[PDB]
């Protein structure tokens, strides 16, 4: 149907007349092709034009490659009779209905668009298969919308390839789709909330459908239950009840009996495959073998229209023509959507709460709850929707409770803005209110509570995702979720150094075009990128090479960096001198336990705090001597790290003047490291003896630099050469039907498991694990391949534990890494010892 803005906002004015939902799935289960047939049937369009076929007008260069990354809620025009709306438990009225349905690409490792489409709708369209049923990945997306609270609607798609490329049998096909139900009775029973109670979907009430995309056919139980309820003398709700379970009509005793046994023991075939699938089975061999022995004559036994160009074709293309006519696309689909998948107004009765979080019974919260479309504007862009206009970025959001207009100066706040600040709170005037339509957007003017649409010119200051509030007391909603957490790492730095400014601009532009992505800098000095999946990352990277940045970018395996530590106490007091042989600094290096060394970098012990009150903290409870803490000079590296300088001397009458000379040289030394070239950790210097010669012409600056240098250089080598390797923290949530598959990954990829736990009785477990920084480069693939995509790794950087090998040892782990680290600089290929760094007469 060809509408205009008034006809749009007409059905938009009607709150109970809008279907706010997306599409939960298990990968390529006819979702993109399902939506293409809906525009060709009656999908609302603009003030002109006429485009109908398949793909093309839903995906673009994604058409030549092959994928769906644009998940928008294209609203359509429904034609639901007044008799259907006769039992709908909503305050909806009319004939002309709206359908705010989002595309949403099902599969895992991309649950980014998935968790963002759930954060803007009351329900969703689940697409399971006949050749797969309710498997691992649907388990993922289904249990996902249940720990989010949404209304479930099933469509066992591809029953077309289950009777053409294969072909099933009558009553055996009963338990096929009845088993897809017993698999749905598993996801619902555990992950469904007590707030919705009895919600296990049963096509015994018209909740589960039957369809195929290239066939243009959409079937719902309620379809022939109503086109036959009257032709039997049975109740409409009791006719579909005697069509699932104890449903055997007898064309002999002519009664809908419970038990299929008779006064002999002979059975009774299903009246569902006797009045609904019996003649339906006749339609199979009807065009499959071209049996004109029924075909047109059987067409009247079913009530179908035979029009010219219909019998003008042949074969399977002919069966698609009567499939889209026996069970029309938009007709049956929009049917169950306008049936048991509500409008924001009647479904937010449970959704409203978990949406806006932080304040118990908040003021704007009760407004979003009862829903007030002219109250304090409550909006949340779950993920901006940028297009292809040289960088024309838009914002994808749910207008909970409130109106938005063209030129409204609203408070565009961010997840960092909390009532008592102004940070990310860029109260800017919106240039224009946008109205997205499937894959494109056009100019509109306003929208109310319970709608889904966008905003423009907000991109200039809003980063990642943003909440739109016009009320100041407004806190924010829940900061999304993501039980997926990015676990991909790459050294994505410049391939052409002349355009480095373009990389950092686009790194944010990646965050700009992504639900969850880490576009930070390397602690080594390169530009690190972190994605959800390998497939995922890869894509956004070529997009970083064409527009986002636009020029040659070289990706390399994640360049690493660890800490330089000591094992036992320094062997002997290391004596040092100047290139003069004048000033002589003698010292040692001692061990700092985790709780006190980690406490240095934490802030418990910080240089930007007086050494008197800081010495009290250490002395009194921790157990760090008072005079030793009132003697700590510098915190290497720079001025706050876990590599101290505690002076334990008594002589040298000129120590007080060049105190910062020892301190500043040490900040330069722990920064550009000895064993390879990076920074140390948990090593505190204990300077015991020193010598101050002639004037300051020999006491300071560069004369003192090669002194404090070889000082700790020789001391690190004496305090025992070892290294603390960087430990990662990943909590993988995966079903008990795959617990030992991840355990295989552990007994192999260093099983430093913090501990294995979860919730005795539930599916997925909470697998706490300690894993090296490099022991995680590809960890994503092995986890899911070990035990299906049932594994869900929660990434973040943890602590540093004991590394077995030794830095100065060329063939052992540590040494091999260090020797490979010096060739990473492009110079020296050896480990110089403290023998060539100790001082004697």
């Amino acid at each position: 149907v060809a509408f205009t803005v008034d006809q749009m906002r007409s059905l938009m004015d009607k709150v109970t007349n809008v279907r706010n939902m997306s599409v939960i799935a298990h990968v390529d289960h006819g979702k993109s092709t399902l939506t293409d047939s809906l525009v060709q049937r009656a999908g609302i369009i603009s003030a002109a034009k006429a485009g109908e076929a398949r793909f093309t007008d839903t995906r673009k260069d994604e058409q030549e490659r092959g994928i769906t990354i644009k998940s928008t809620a294209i609203s359509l025009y429904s034609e639901m009779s007044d008799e259907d709306v006769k039992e709908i438990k909503q305050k909806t009225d009319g004939n002309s209905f709206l359908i705010n349905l989002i595309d949403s690409p099902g599969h895992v490792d991309f649950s980014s668009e998935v968790t963002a489409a759930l954060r803007v709708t009351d329900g969703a369209l689940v697409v399971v298969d006949t050749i797969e049923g309710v498997c691992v990945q649907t388990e993922t997306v289904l249990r996902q919308a249940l720990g989010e609270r949404i209304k479930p609607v099933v469509v066992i798609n591809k029953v077309d390839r289950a009777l053409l490329e294969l072909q099933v049998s009558k009553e055996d096909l009963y338990q096929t789709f009845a088993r897809t139900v017993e698999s749905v009775n598993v996801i619902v029973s555990t992950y469904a909330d007590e707030v919705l109670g009895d919600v296990q979907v049963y096509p015994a009430r018209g909740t589960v459908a039957f369809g195929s995309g290239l066939h243009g056919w959409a079937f719902t139980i309620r379809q022939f239950a109503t086109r036959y309820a009257k032709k039997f003398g049975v109740d409409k709700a009791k006719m579909m009840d005697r069509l699932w379970g104890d449903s055997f009509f007898n064309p002999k005793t002519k009664k809908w009996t419970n038990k299929d046994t008779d006064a002999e023991g002979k059975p009774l075939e299903r009246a569902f495959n006797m009045f609904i699938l019996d003649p339906i089975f006749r339609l199979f061999t009807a065009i499959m073998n071209f049996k004109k022995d029924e075909i047109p004559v059987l067409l009247e036994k079913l009530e179908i229209v035979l029009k010219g160009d219909e019998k003008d074709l042949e074969g399977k293309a002919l069966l698609k023509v009567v499939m889209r006519k026996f069970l029309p696309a938009a007709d049956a689909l929009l049917e169950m959507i306008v049936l048991h998948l509500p409008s924001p107004v009647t479904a937010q009765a449970y959704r409203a709460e978990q949406l806006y979080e932080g304040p118990a019974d908040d003021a704007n919260c009760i407004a979003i709850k009862n829903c007030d479309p002219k109250a304090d504007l409550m909006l949340y862009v779950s993920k901006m929707v940028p297009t292809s206009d040289k960088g024309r970025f838009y914002a994808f959001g749910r207008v909970f409770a409130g109106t938005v207009k063209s030129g409204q100066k609203v408070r565009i706040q961010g997840p960092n803005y909390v009532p008592g600040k102004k940070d990310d709170l860029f109260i800017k005037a919106i240039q224009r209110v946008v109205l997205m339509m499937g894959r494109f957007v056009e100019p509109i003017d306003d929208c109310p509570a319970g709608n889904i649409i966008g905003l423009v010119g907000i991109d200039q200051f809003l980063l990642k995702t943003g909440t739109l509030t016009t009320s100041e007391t407004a806190h924010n909603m829940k900061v999304m979720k993501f039980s997926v957490s990015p676990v991909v790492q790459v050294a994505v730095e410049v391939k052409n150094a002349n355009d480095l400014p373009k990389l950092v601009e686009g790194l944010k532009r990646l965050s700009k075009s992504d639900p969850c992505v880490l576009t930070y800098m390397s602690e080594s000095g390169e530009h690190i990128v972190a994605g959800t999946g390998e497939l995922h990352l890869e894509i956004c990277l070529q997009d970083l090479e064409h527009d986002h940045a636009g020029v040659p970018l070289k990706i390399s395996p994640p360049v690493v960096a660890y800490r330089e530590t000591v094992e036992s106490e320094s062997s002997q007091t290391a004596l040092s001198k100047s290139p003069n042989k004048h000033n002589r600094i003698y010292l040692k290096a001692e061990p700092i336990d985790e709780e006190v060394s980690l406490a240095i970098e934490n802030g418990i012990i910080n240089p930007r705090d007086d050494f008197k009150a800081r010495a009290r903290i250490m002395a009194d409870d921790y157990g760090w001597d008072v005079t030793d803490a009132r003697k700590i000079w510098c915190f290497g590296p720079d001025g706050n790290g876990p590599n101290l300088v505690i002076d334990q001397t008594k002589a040298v009458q000129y120590l007080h003047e060049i105190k910062d000379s020892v301190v500043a040289a040490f900040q330069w030394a722990t920064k550009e490291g000895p064993i390879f070239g990076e920074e140390m950790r948990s090593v505190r210097v204990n300077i015991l003896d020193v010598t101050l010669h002639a004037d300051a012409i020999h006491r300071g600056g560069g004369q003192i630099i090669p002194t404090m240098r070889r000082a700790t250089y020789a001391g690190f080598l004496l305090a025992d050469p070892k290294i603390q390797e960087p430990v990662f923290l990943v909590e993988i949530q995966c079903p008990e039907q795959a617990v030992g598959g991840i355990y295989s990954v552990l007994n192999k990829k260093r099983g430093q498991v913090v501990s294995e736990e979860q919730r005795p009785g539930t599916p997925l477990f909470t697998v706490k694990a300690y894993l090296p920084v490099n022991e995680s480069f590809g960890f994503t693939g092995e986890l899911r391949q070990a035990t299906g995509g049932q594994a869900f790794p929660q990434m973040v950087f943890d602590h540093w534990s004991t590394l077995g090998s030794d830095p100065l040892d060329p063939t052992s782990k540590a040494g091999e890494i260090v020797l490979a680290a010096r060739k990473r600089h492009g110079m020296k290929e050896e480990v110089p010892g403290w023998q060539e760094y100790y001082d004697k007469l």
Partner: protein, 89 residues
């Protein structure tokens, strides 16, 4: 008496069962799929919504069938080491 049971050795009496709740949390029902029985969920607890005539009384029993029947506490080898010959004073 006492004597519980064994699996996959004999198929003696006809396998019959009633339709009420077992009360077990949702788990071993992924095999109740691939097998084919009328099941559902009673507010979480695993409830059989029909009296099923599983297998026959005179065939080869196995691995899949013993899993669901051992969860019901059924014991077909209802017998107990008893007597044979008799002798007294």
């Amino acid at each position: 008496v006492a004597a519980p049971a064994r699996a996959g050795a004999v198929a003696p009496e006809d396998i019959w069962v009633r339709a009420v709740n077992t009360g077990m949390e949702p788990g071993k029902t992924s095999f109740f799929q691939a097998l084919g029985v009328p099941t559902k969920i009673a507010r979480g607890t695993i409830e059989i919504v029909s009296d099923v005539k599983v297998v026959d009384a005179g065939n080869k029993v196995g691995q899949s069938e013993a899993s669901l029947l051992n969860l019901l506490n059924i014991s077909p080898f209802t017998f107990g080491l008893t007597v044979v010959q008799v002798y007294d004073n």
